[PDB]
Design an enzyme around this catalytic site. Sequence first.
Site, PDB file in Angstrom:
ATOM      1  N   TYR A   1      33.856  41.672  45.422  1.00 34.04           N
ATOM      2  CA  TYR A   1      35.289  41.296  45.378  1.00 34.04           C
ATOM      3  C   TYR A   1      35.916  41.522  46.767  1.00 34.04           C
ATOM      4  O   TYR A   1      36.624  40.641  47.307  1.00 34.04           O
ATOM      5  CB  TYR A   1      35.998  42.101  44.294  1.00 34.04           C
TER       6      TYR A   1
ATOM      7  N   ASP B   1      36.695  24.637  36.884  1.00 31.18           N
ATOM      8  CA  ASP B   1      36.132  25.851  37.517  1.00 31.18           C
ATOM      9  C   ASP B   1      36.315  25.680  39.032  1.00 31.18           C
ATOM     10  O   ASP B   1      35.836  24.677  39.583  1.00 31.18           O
ATOM     11  CB  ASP B   1      34.673  26.009  37.092  1.00 31.18           C
TER      12      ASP B   1
ATOM     13  N   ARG C   1      39.508  27.295  32.869  1.00 33.24           N
ATOM     14  CA  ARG C   1      38.187  26.898  32.335  1.00 33.24           C
ATOM     15  C   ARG C   1      38.298  26.440  30.877  1.00 33.24           C
ATOM     16  O   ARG C   1      37.409  25.683  30.450  1.00 33.24           O
ATOM     17  CB  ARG C   1      37.218  28.068  32.478  1.00 33.24           C
TER      18      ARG C   1
ATOM     19  N   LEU D   1      45.033  41.035  29.981  1.00 38.82           N
ATOM     20  CA  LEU D   1      43.625  41.363  30.346  1.00 38.82           C
ATOM     21  C   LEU D   1      43.497  42.833  30.762  1.00 38.82           C
ATOM     22  O   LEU D   1      42.509  43.468  30.372  1.00 38.82           O
ATOM     23  CB  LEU D   1      43.135  40.445  31.469  1.00 38.82           C
TER      24      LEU D   1
ATOM     25  N   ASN E   1      44.654  30.736  43.138  1.00 37.17           N
ATOM     26  CA  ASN E   1      44.854  31.986  42.379  1.00 37.17           C
ATOM     27  C   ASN E   1      43.603  32.308  41.554  1.00 37.17           C
ATOM     28  O   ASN E   1      43.422  33.490  41.212  1.00 37.17           O
ATOM     29  CB  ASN E   1      46.127  31.862  41.543  1.00 37.17           C
TER      30      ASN E   1
ATOM     31  N   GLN F   1      49.748  54.191  51.935  1.00 32.28           N
ATOM     32  CA  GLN F   1      49.158  55.553  52.063  1.00 32.28           C
ATOM     33  C   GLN F   1      47.649  55.461  52.319  1.00 32.28           C
ATOM     34  O   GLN F   1      46.990  54.438  52.056  1.00 32.28           O
ATOM     35  CB  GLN F   1      49.461  56.399  50.827  1.00 32.28           C
TER      36      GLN F   1
END
Lengths: 251, 251, 251, 251
Positions: free
Chosen positions: C155, C62, C38, C194, C89, C251
Amino acid sequence: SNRLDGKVAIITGGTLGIGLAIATKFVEEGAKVMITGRHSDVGEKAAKSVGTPFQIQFFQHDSSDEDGWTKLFDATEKAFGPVSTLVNNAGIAVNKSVEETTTAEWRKLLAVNLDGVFFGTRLGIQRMKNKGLGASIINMSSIEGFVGDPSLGAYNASKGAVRIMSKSAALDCALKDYDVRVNTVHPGYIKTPLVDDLPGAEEAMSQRTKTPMGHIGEPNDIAYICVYLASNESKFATGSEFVVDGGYTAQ
Amino acid sequence: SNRLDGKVAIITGGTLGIGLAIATKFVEEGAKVMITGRHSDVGEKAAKSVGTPFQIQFFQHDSSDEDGWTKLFDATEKAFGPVSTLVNNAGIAVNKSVEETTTAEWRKLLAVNLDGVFFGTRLGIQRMKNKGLGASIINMSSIEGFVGDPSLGAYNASKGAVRIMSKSAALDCALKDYDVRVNTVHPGYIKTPLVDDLPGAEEAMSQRTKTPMGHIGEPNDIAYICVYLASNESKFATGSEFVVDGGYTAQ
Amino acid sequence: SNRLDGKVAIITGGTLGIGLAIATKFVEEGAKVMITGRHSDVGEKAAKSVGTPFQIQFFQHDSSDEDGWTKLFDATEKAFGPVSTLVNNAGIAVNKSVEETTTAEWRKLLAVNLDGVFFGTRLGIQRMKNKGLGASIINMSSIEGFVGDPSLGAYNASKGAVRIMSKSAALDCALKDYDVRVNTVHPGYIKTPLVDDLPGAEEAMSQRTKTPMGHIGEPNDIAYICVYLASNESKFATGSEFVVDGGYTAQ
Amino acid sequence: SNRLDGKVAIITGGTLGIGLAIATKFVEEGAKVMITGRHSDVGEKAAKSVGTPFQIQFFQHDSSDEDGWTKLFDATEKAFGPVSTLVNNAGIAVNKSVEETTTAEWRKLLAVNLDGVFFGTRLGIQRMKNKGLGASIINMSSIEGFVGDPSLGAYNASKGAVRIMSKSAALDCALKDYDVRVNTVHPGYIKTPLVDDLPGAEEAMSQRTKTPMGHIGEPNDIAYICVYLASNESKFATGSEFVVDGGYTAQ
Ligand SMILES: [Cl-]
Ligand SMILES: [Cl-]
Ligand SMILES: [Mg+2]
Ligand SMILES: [Mg+2]
């Protein structure tokens, strides 16, 4: 019998096929039911075919319509008391590969199949948590939530989304002690009037390379797993996927 | 009620805990039941605690014992008529990592948990195919069939084996039109007297990093999914995995 | 060396963290790369840090911007010739449960994480089919495509969608002999500047109850599996999920 | 080049087909390799075809032979120094349904495909833990570890066992900071001289209803994913399943 004693269920797309079978068995097991659909003509007839307005009513709604979801929970509570059970069954299909999906088709299908399930799950958790209802959200998530189909690209996206979003919601409700379970049901091919109206469709779906049993299911096959998941019999099942598919995904 | 009208079920490890709950609900839904276990003392008491010998009987058997499987099907048919339903529930656990598993421990656990399920499934298909029984084989395959546990190496091997072997058997029965379904049930942690006898075990299993619901299940949680799978309500479910685990595998 | 000889790759969100590592290793292995992001300040610096404009360039974009996708493929072809390789990605996260997700948050995250991967995959197939390029579309589909997280509802929806949509695209490309493969990569937790900026994030991710290795990964962990999937070494891999997660999902 | 610098690998069933391709690429990438097989005529020819005895040797071994596993690790250490890498590739198939599988067939197949992978994995962990080798155990776990095949009952049992046992081992090694990773590779159908010897096998495998790519793979398809998993490129991958199958499991 009385396996859904005291339950109050909303079933989206409950006016025909799988949704109507779920509504029918829910009423037979003692649940009060509000069915939804786009068409008043179909929906009012369907409700009356199942039971009295003290057992089952219709509410006209497009699952993509966020404001309508509030009206739907308000109407169900007014008719039957607090909602305990939500079956997010409303859905559409586009018969396009990813390559051949138009942006308009993509947005329309996600609005019903993904936005609708999000709006219903989000509101259901808020309205049904912390009331000792044994609350249960059942999201319809297809064998197309497990495997790809080259000519169901957008539908595959929507069903994968519902599959994993439901786990997120199951975990948050469990960790916060909300008394709300969230699970997904994954039908294989089911004989409905819509399948019967497409010449050769059932025969194609019944080929052993598709459905190993060599025939397709009936709406009651999905109704019975939904009764289990709505009932308190399933009080330890959350974040799980329940496949009823004649062996489709086993090969 | 009468959800298992006319059914004749063998339940291995049916004398205590989950197996006994499955046997109890099966009798309550109208099935005739033969329960198995290693110990006559436990097994004869368990059968009498559930019902009359016209409803439920005990047969002493180690599931690892191939010749005993023939005797078990013969005794069940003599008591109740042709067997329609097999629940392969007998199992043992070794609390060792793969690294720390002795060959003797490996062979002993596979003999019960894998050989036993193979012997029961193989014989069940032969004895229950092509008789219009709505036959159903329910293999117990654990959340340890989906995820690893660092201190359950051999148990993980056995439960992964049962999970995929069951799909093979489901597909062959479907393709050959045998009228036999094969499915797996995957319990998470369940409160039994054996758990209650280990100080701190339930508390450890109830931590949110294990079971998101913050408590463990009860034997009836597994009994109810087994009634669904034994019944004709599940006539389109074959080759599927049914998880009841309080959210364990969803995170 | 030269594992991506002659390849021309687009990497969305290629200006930082995982995307930048993929771009860096792609250039090392002989690919020509267009990275997107961006912010031109970040993007132009990132391209120059990796290579010359004959090796790598930046295109401001974007991934939610459908018209921009056309311009991005046009610009990449003009710079480097026909595109062989796409890494979808670019992604954003909202740290809300399904219950707490606002509609604006939902729409914003799906626009980037789901619409953008759809736009990229669809255009990728259209532009790279039938050119003998050994074409490869790599979709970033997260461990959150396999398991729920109570505080990542939208998400999880987006990553489950990408997981199954990718299988649809893989199958259509394989069945139509398009010479296009589609696969998903599912990173666990990866140390980036980040993550370093979120106090306690790496420490929480590194708990054994989250990542069994007791530490999180680094961007090159994802770069190396992307080199394998972009290369002709993976010419029989399509519709597959590649997890690199420190044991998180085992797990 | 040099992607396996300093590695010392054991590859079971390394004298033919997939195992031979893995061995060939491992030597190319700088590993020292001990290949095993049942027949010294095949094995000595295979080692000499790939490299010098300083690069690659043969050790005669049936993977079912527990005592032979000790001798194999001893011989590899003597030739090449401490073992860093184990590929459990040796396997056999019985072309029987569960129903039709004899007990002798069952025991024979589990001895190679399950006992042998257990013996190798257990010994691998014991010998390669805590040596800073970047150790890696790669278990061949088949597409038959994910889906059933009606005529591969015992094979399906063995591959499902390896799939979940490997996760157990991965977790224990990660939690104990052993510097050992454990992963599974799941080939689809691969063209080998042995497949060429079964009339119609490749043609049946190549039907779009089986392998969507409409052809089967070649041994190097499996070699390249094994190089990635043996190398330090995959240092964050443990407890993962790597499928290379032409789209078989995506539909
Ligand atoms: Cl940027
Ligand atoms: Cl040999
Ligand atoms: Mg988990
Ligand atoms: Mg399949």
